[PDB]
Subunit: 154 residues, 4 copies
């Protein structure tokens, strides 16, 4: 029985720690571009989604670490799409929190692999996808990316 007016999607995650502040881009129809920054961890994470055949810039999550290396991943949408997302979660000493954050991220599409970005240290995690698509990102950010999760759809 329907009890709310907002549609929903399957959501997996989050991988990472409880620090930072929660954010959720919601869901769209695909992924066109990913902009992130990295160093000893993943700092910024912002996405340009596809919305019914046209680009749609999602809310930004730059974090507050200005010294990281910036990276732009432009996917050959719609022929190229993610088939796997993996990374590492662990404590970053200079944060003085003792709580896990996203240390590294790797993006694998049906065409190639982007990454690893950041530092592969801590506990690894991976989300291989056999059927379906990531149609949205969610997570937690403070100084850097604390945690990440994904909205999935057929």
């Amino acid at each position: 029985t329907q009890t709310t007016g907002t549609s929903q999607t399957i959501e997996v995650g989050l991988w990472g720690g409880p620090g930072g502040n929660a954010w959720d881009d919601g869901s769209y129809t695909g992924i066109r571009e990913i902009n992130l920054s990295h160093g000893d961890a993943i700092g910024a994470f912002s996405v340009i989604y596809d919305l019914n055949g046209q680009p749609f810039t999602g809310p930004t999550h730059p974090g507050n670490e200005p010294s990281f290396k910036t990276v732009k991943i432009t996917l050959d949408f719609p022929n190229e799409f993610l088939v796997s997302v993996s990374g590492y979660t662990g404590v970053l000493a200079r944060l003085a929190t003792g709580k896990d954050v996203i240390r590294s991220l790797t993006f694998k599409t049906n065409k190639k692999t982007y990454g690893p970005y950041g530092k592969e240290e801590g506990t690894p995690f991976s989300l291989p996808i056999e059927n379906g698509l990531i149609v949205g990102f969610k997570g937690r950010s403070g100084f850097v990316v604390d945690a990440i999760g994904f909205h999935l759809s057929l």
Copy 2:
């Protein structure tokens, strides 16, 4: 196995005739407002969708009947949502095509009923929903709304 980068939704319809030009707004996360015009049939039809908590103006489908009366259905989103859409499909004498067009439309939410709009003549049709939501509209339009269909999602 995934073979495309564009996600999908269930699609039902179309109800109505083969006339006019086909249109499809695509899919979103909900419905915020519906703007239509009616006389001896449904003329204009445009929707303001919800996209992850923010309104998104969908493509317009004004048709071409300057004499029709305009109507604005502003839903109390997300608390209020459609639980049924019904209407009538039939020929319009002045079109002299022998083909059906959307003569009438009635929108029923969990809070109230809007309509009927237009003229309830021809063959009735209806889409009562028990679980899930309409997250997008599609159809065909010329001078009036020739046909209509819906994208559905949980």
Copy 3:
């Protein structure tokens, strides 16, 4: 946020009256065969669903009209599937209920059309499908099929 252990599917309908007793076959992987009976209305209705590549006999809804013509619709699963279900709802005088029942049903697959079964009198209804599949039937039955609805899935 998940709150129950039972998965769900989009559900449309019901079309028909409030008489008889409610039933819901639930959802499966597809439809292999439909067995029904018809005369001046639709009497018995039971389905052989597909459950992950193997047939699964669904709950029976025999009704109580022994005089009806019995029909078996064996689909060439999985290449053949329903793209539309339509019919008529209305009062059947002899039932002495004054409530609408399923007077007629027509099943259209991508290969051919089965029916019309029963009597095409009353109010028509139709569910044409552009994307997705009927993966389960639900409704209400007494001596005949009082109402019917469908579970949809990609």
Copy 4:
């Protein structure tokens, strides 16, 4: 547009190695009971799924480990359901294959945590779920569980 009569679900995984023989239980509407055996790895793995309110015995994947202790996880379905499945993948010396297998598994429902089962050695993996349900299991098995994956649905 629909082009096949077989419905589908999102599928994630597999986690583990390439050894053993592939299997896929397919999808259902829930999980009632999980049966497995464990020692220095996960040996047997079977499930009693829910299929529209009734139990459905899933295909068996006993592997072949006489010394492994057997566990029967009977969930308080439908109120109790998995919110996370995690474990470890890695080589098991005695198998003499040099390929990764499922060394350990932990099941976390909204009520309690079951496990860890087996030995937490090798590379960890985890599937936390925020929205949706695991409605089917798939993987590869030989003497033990070589790999595992999941079918997800709302």
